[PDB]
């Protein structure tokens, strides 16, 4: 019979890869068919090149894919369009904000599988420790915190304490650490939905000149190499106060045997000031069927077994990634597991977008630009001043002739 092949998630990330793994597994079982599950590296603008390889080529090599939420626009081609498979009632158990991101020119490209949100991990100890009993509101409370809890950690005898940690590697989660940088500060969307290049502006260089601050200072001077699981291993060995990172983390931090078990809150990411937005980027993963699949009905079977209520309350409950299902948010279990859930849903509800709905396929292009010129400011090379007028150029040639 056929062998289903599925691309999605990384066993270099979390217990992602080896989750779904067990679930594509758990179908194949259930089902009586034949899978296979191929591994993928850990960031995603990674995964995105890997996965254009088997789409170049037309490649019957793999049935199902997991996609970033800023694909649709670049992989739509290759995608088989979902919508004759779902009717109206199952579409709407979906959040209907990512069902709409997933359609491109009205083809369903994708289901939605989990979604994500940038938030703020606290050491709760070491708060009540130093005297403070809410985590920071602002960006200045953050490093007030940050720099007397380092000083008094650093004192006691820990020489790998810090106060900060989060992802400022040359990848897409600087991009999505920048943006929230960029429009907690009033900055605005670096482009946004109507098409106006907006980052070159005064609260956008603050932003970035702010983050530069950190590196070195409040934050390791390899902040700058960082992404998820960089940031996570510092503050899961309990040698940061403060993480920006995805709920993820969560569940991998309350694993018996880890050192912070026990020992830490999450909320939202921290702003300039008390009438600036609140950010946390949308992230999220969704599930789509080749276009280059032999099996297409399979497959699809395969993707709403994966999409469905008990598969994303066991990734809720054991991995601590959100579900796309509202009722989820309702479930008893869901939230005695994770009470944040509740707290948070508003932060995760007003998660801002990057703009990969504007670039469409030149997203890609557009979101390198942005993490090397804030990367630039980062290292010390560039003032955020200058970083924002190059940005501004760049995305302004990247996207010169492209609408909608
Ligand atoms: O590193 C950035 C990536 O982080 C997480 O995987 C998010 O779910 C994804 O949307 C984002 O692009
Ligand atoms: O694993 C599938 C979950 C069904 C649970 C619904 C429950 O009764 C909520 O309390």
Redesign the pocket.
């Known amino acids: 019979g056929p062998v289903i092949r599925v691309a999605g998630d990384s066993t270099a990330?979390g217990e992602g890869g080896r989750w779904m793994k067990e679930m594509v597994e758990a179908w194949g079982k259930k089902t009586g068919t034949r899978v296979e599950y191929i591994d993928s590296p850990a960031?995603?603008?990674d995964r995105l090149a890997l996965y254009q390889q088997y789409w170049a080529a037309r490649s019957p090599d793999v049935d199902v894919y997991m996609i970033?939420?800023?694909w649709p626009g670049i992989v739509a081609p290759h995608a088989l369009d979902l919508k004759p498979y779902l009717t109206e009632a199952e579409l709407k158990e979906f959040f209907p904000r990512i069902v709409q991101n997933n359609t491109i020119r009205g083809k369903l490209t994708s289901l939605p599988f989990?979604?994500?949100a940038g938030i703020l991990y606290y050491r709760k100890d070491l708060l009540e420790k130093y005297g403070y009993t809410s985590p920071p509101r602002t960006w200045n409370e953050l490093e007030q915190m940050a720099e007397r809890v380092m000083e008094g950690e650093r004192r006691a005898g820990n020489r790998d304490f810090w106060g900060f940690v989060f992802?400022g590697k040359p990848?897409?989660?600087l991009?999505?650490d920048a943006l929230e940088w960029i429009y907690s500060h009033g900055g605005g969307r670096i482009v946004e939905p109507d098409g106006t290049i907006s980052v070159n502006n005064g609260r956008a260089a603050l932003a970035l000149n702010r983050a530069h601050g950190w590196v070195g200072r409040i934050a390791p001077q390899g902040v700058t190499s960082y992404?998820?699981e960089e940031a996570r291993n510092v503050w899961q060995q309990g040698n940061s106060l403060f993480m920006r990172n995805?709920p993820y983390a969560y569940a991998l931090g309350q694993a018996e045997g880890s050192p912070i078990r026990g020992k830490f809150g999450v909320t939202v990411l921290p702003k300039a000031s008390a009438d600036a937005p609140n950010a946390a980027?949308?992230?999220?993963?969704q599930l789509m069927v080749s276009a280059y699949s032999r099996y297409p009905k399979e497959a699809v079977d395969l993707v709403k077994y994966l999409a469905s209520y008990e598969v994303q309350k066991d990734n809720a409950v054991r991995l601590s990634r959100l579900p796309t299902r509202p009722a989820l948010y309702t479930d008893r279990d869901v939230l005695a597991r994770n009470p944040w859930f509740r707290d948070l849903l508003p932060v995760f509800q007003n998660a801002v977008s990057?703009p990969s709905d504007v670039a469409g396929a030149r997203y890609n292009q557009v979101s390198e630009a942005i993490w090397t010129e804030v990367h630039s400011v980062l290292t010390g090379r560039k003032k955020g001043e200058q970083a924002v007028r190059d940005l501004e150029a760049r995305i302004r040639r990247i996207l010169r002739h492209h609408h909608h």
């Open positions: 990330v960031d995603t603008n970033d939420v800023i989990f979604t994500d992802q990848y897409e989660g991009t999505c992404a998820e995805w980027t949308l992230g999220g993963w990057r």
